Amino acid sequence: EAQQKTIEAITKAINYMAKRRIGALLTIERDTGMGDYIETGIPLNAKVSSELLINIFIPNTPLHDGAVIMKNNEIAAAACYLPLSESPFISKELGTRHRAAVGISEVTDSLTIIVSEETGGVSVAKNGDLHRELTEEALKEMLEAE
Amino acid sequence: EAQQKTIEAITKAINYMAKRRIGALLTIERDTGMGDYIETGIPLNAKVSSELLINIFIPNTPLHDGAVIMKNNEIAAAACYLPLSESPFISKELGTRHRAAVGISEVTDSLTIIVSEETGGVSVAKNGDLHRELTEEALKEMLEAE
Amino acid sequence: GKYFGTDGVRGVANSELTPELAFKVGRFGGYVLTKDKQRPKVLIGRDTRISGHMLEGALVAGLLSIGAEVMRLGVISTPGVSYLTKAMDAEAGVMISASHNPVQDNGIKFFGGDGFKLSDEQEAEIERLMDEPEDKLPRPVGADLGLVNDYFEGGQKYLQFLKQTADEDFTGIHVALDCANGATSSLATHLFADLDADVSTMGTSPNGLNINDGVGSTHPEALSAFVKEKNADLGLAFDGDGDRLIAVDEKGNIVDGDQIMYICSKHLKSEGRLKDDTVVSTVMSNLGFYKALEKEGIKSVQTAVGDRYVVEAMKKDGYNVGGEQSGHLIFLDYNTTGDGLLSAIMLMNTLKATGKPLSELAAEMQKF
Amino acid sequence: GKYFGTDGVRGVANSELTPELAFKVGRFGGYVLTKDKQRPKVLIGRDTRISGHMLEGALVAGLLSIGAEVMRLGVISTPGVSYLTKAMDAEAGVMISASHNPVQDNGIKFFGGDGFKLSDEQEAEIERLMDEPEDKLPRPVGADLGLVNDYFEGGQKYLQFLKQTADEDFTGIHVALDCANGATSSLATHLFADLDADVSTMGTSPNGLNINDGVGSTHPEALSAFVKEKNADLGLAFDGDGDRLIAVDEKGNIVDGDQIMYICSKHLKSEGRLKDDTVVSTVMSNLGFYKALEKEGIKSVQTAVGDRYVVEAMKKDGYNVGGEQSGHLIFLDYNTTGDGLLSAIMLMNTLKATGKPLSELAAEMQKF
C-alpha cells in the first residue's frame, strides 16, 4: 500500500550514498515513541522523498551532523543526537555513528541504517545487533519486514 | 507572533548563503495561489528552519536545481520551476535564476529573494521590479512587511 | 607515439588535442586499468575550460565502451581529484585541464588508485595501443556496458577534508582571493567563508573563456593592486586547476613558492609535525631560501625540476614537505600532489598561530 | 554507405552503433546543419538506455567540434524533442533512442527546425562526408568552439504544452499507466497527476536495463492484468520513446491503434475540428476500421506503412489526423510526429466528454 513508496525512496537514497561514501545515519520509529530524541534535532516534519534524504547527509551542512528520525511515513527531524552504547562487540576503527546507531536500538524497538563514511558499506541496527556489509536485496528484504 | 520565527529563519539562512556565494531562489506566496507551480518540484510540506533551507541549495544536489516555494509558514516544495520573464531590464550580467525570480513575480502577488552565485548579491523581486545588492537590514525590513 | 609528457597529454583543443584522441585515451587507458575487476571505477574532473565539456564527453564515451564505472565531478580542482580517487578506492581519476596555460589549451592527466601519476609502465601500454590501427579491444554489449552516476557533490567531500586541516577558524582575518576564473572559484569561496573569515573575491567569475586571463598564480599583478585596494591582510592567487599558490602580503609584494615553503615548514617544525625537520625542493629555488633554512635548523634535500621528482624523493625517504618555486607545494601528510588551497590553509595557520602580518613572516627569508 | 534507415541510424550499441560513429554523426551532421549561422543550436534528448549516456556524450562531442551550440535535454520522449526544436527556433534536434527495441539496441534520430525528419538531401550529405576517409572539416579553436548550456527544464515546457491540450481536467477518472520503463516514466505520471486523475503506475521504475521488458506498447499483457487488478477505468501503454500508445479498457481488452484512431477522430468531428472530416491511415489498418469510418461520415486516405508516408499525406493537403494500427498517432494540430501522451490526452478527452467507458467507445468499430 503506502509501504511500497517511502521504502522505494529509502533504498534509492541508501544506494545513492553508498556508491559515494557519504556518512548516513537513519533511524525509523516503530513502537518505542522516541519523542525525547526528536527534540534534539532540527524539526522538519517533511514528507519522505529520496531526494530530500540525500540532501540531508551532504558532507558539510548544518543538518548533516547527526541522525534522521522517521516517525509515520515522514521525516520527523534531522541531525538528531542518539546515545552511544559502549558495547564491546563494536569493532573499533569505526563507530562514532555506528556507536550511536546500535546505541539507539539498545533502548528502542526502532531500526537504524548506517552508511560508513570510510567504506560505504550499508549497516543495520535492531535491538543492539549490528550487521555490517549488507547487500542491496538484503536491505530491501530487511525493510519490507518493517 | 509566529511571524518573527520563519522570518528569523529566512534571514540567517540567506546571510549564510551570501557569505559563501551559493545561488539561491526563494519565493513567498501571499494571495496568488501557486498550485500550478508547486506541483513542479519535490514536495515537502516541511516546517521552516534556517538549517533546512541551507541544505536545500548546496552547489549541486537533487534539491538544489530550482526554486523554493513557501506556502503558509511551510516550505511547500523545492526544485520548483518558474517561468522566465524576458524583460530588457534584467542586466545581461546575470540571469537564469534572476530571470525566473522576476518572471514569477510578474504573474503573482509573490515575493522572491535571490542570491547571485557569481557575486553573493542578495536581490528581491516584487511585481516585476527587482532590486540588486540589498543589505541585511534591507532584507529584514522588506520581509517584516509581508 | 609520444602522447604522455610531464603533465600528461596536452595540446590546443580540437586542433591538436582532438576529441577523437581523448576518446582513444579513455578507451585504451580504461582497458589498461581494467585488468583487475571487470567494472573499474574511474572518476573525472575538469576546470572551467570551454573545451572541457567537449573533451569530457569524448573521454566518458571511451570509458563506457569498455565497461568502466564513471563518476563525473563537474568543476573541481586537480587536488580534489587526487583526494577523491584515493578516498573512494577508485581505480583511477582523470583531470581535463591545462593549468595556467591560455584558455585555448587543454589537457588530460591521469592518477593511479593511490592518487599518484600513472606508473610509466601503464602509460607505455596506453601508447602501445594508440599505435595499432586496429581496435581489437573488447566491445561489451547490453548490461556489460559502462555505467554512469554523477557525483557533483564530491566537491564538498574534498572541501570537508580541507576544513578539518584548519587548526581553528580564521576569525579576524581579511583575505583576498584570486581564483584565475578556474576550478577553485566555487570551491575556495565556500572554504574560507565557512572558516569565518572576511573574504574579498576576484577572478571568481569564470565563463569558460576567461581562465588565467590576467589573473592567477602566473599574473599576480591584478591581485597585488586589489589587496592594497581592499587593504586586505593578504591575497591568495591559485591558478587554473588549483595546484599552485602565490601569496601577496599586505604591502602588495608577491610571495612566491620558496617564501611560502619557508613560512610553513618553520611553523611545522615548531608543531614538530615537520618530519625529520627536512624539506624537499627543486634546483629552481633561490639561494637565500636555503640560507634562511639553515638559520632555523631545517635540513634539506634537492631534486630535479618538475614535481614528479619532488614527489619521488619524499617517497623513498618518508619526507613531509616539498615544493617548487612555482607555488606547487605538496604536504604528504594530507594530499598526494600539489594543493593550492591546502597550501593556503597552512599559510593561514601560520598567520593565525603567530599573529604576525604576512610581510613580516616573509622577511625572515632574504632573497639574493 | 547506408547509415540513415527509417528511424535514423540504428544498431546494437557499442558493437554496431559505436560511439565512434555517433561522433561522426554530430560532427558531420552538425556541419550539414551549420550552413546557415556559424553557431547552430541543436538540442539533444535520450531515453533511459544505459548506452544512451555513451552515445549522448559521443554525440555532443561531435557537435561541439564544429561550433554548434548544444542544449542537453536528458530524458524526454521523442515527441518532446520535436516540440522543443520547433518551439525554440533551434536548427535541429537529436533523440538517442530505439523505440520498443531491446535495451541493447539504440539509435540516433534527426529532426529539422520545423520538427520533421531531416530533408533527404541533408541526410545524403551526411553519409557523403562519412565516406571520405579524411576528416577535412573545419576545427574551430578557442572561442570558436561549440557551446553547451543544459536545458533539463524542457521536460516541463513540453509538459505545460500537453496540459493545455486537455479540454478540461480528468477529475474522477482512474487510469493505470505503463510507460515501458522509458522516457515517458517521470513525464506521464506528473501529467495525469496534475490533471487530477487517479493515477496507478507500473513500469514506472526504469534503470537503464529494464526498458521495454514485458511492458510498453508491444507487451500489453502486464497492463491488462494490472488494469483489472486495481479495476482502473482504463490502461495506457506508451513505449520506450513515447510515440506509440496502446490502450486497455476496464474489461482488460486491448485497444490497438486503429481503435484509438477511431475513438478520437470520431470525437473530433463532433467539435468541428477534424479537417474536412478525413483521417489518413496505412495499408496495415484493419478493414472494420474503414467500415465504421464511413458509418460516421468520415472519409479516409490510405498510404503505405511507415509514418514518413502518413505524414507526407497530411502534409500536401492539410489533413488533421493520421496514424497506424501500431498506435503511432499524429495530431498535426499540436505536434509534427507521433505522440503517445497527446494521443493519450485526446483519448481522455473522449472518455470524459461522453462519460462512456472505453469498452463502449471501442465497440462501435467492429474488427474483422
Author numbering:
A (entry chain H), B (entry chain I): 107 to 252
C (entry chain F), D (entry chain C): 2 to 369
Q: Could you pull the original sentences from the published paper?
A:
The GlmMF369 variant lacks the flexible C-terminal domain 4 and was constructed to aid subsequent structural investigations. On the other hand, diffracting crystals were obtained for the CdaACD:GlmMF369 complex, in which the GlmM protein lacks the flexible C-terminal domain 4. The crystals were obtained under two different conditions (see Experimental procedures section), and the structure of the CdaACD:GlmMF369 complex could be solved at 3.6 Å (Complex 1) and at 4.2 Å (Complex 2) by molecular replacement using the B. subtilis CdaACD and GlmM (dimer) structures as search models. While obtained under two different conditions, complex 1 and complex 2 were nearly identical and overlapped with an r.m.s.d. of 0.22 Å. Furthermore, in both complex structures, three complex molecules were obtained in the asymmetric unit and each complex was composed of a GlmMF369 dimer and a CdaACD dimer in the inactive dimer configuration. The three complexes obtained in the asymmetric unit were almost identical to each other, as indicated by the superposition r.m.s.d. of 0.15 to 0.20 Å for complex 1 and of 0.15 to 0.16 Å for complex 2. Since the obtained complex structures were basically identical, all further descriptions are based on the higher resolution complex 1 structure. In the complex, a CdaACD dimer was positioned in the large groove at the top of the GlmMF369 dimer and formed interactions with domain 2 of GlmM. Based on the atomic-resolution complex structure data, we suggest that GlmM inhibits the activity of CdaACD by preventing the formation of active head-to-head cyclase oligomers.
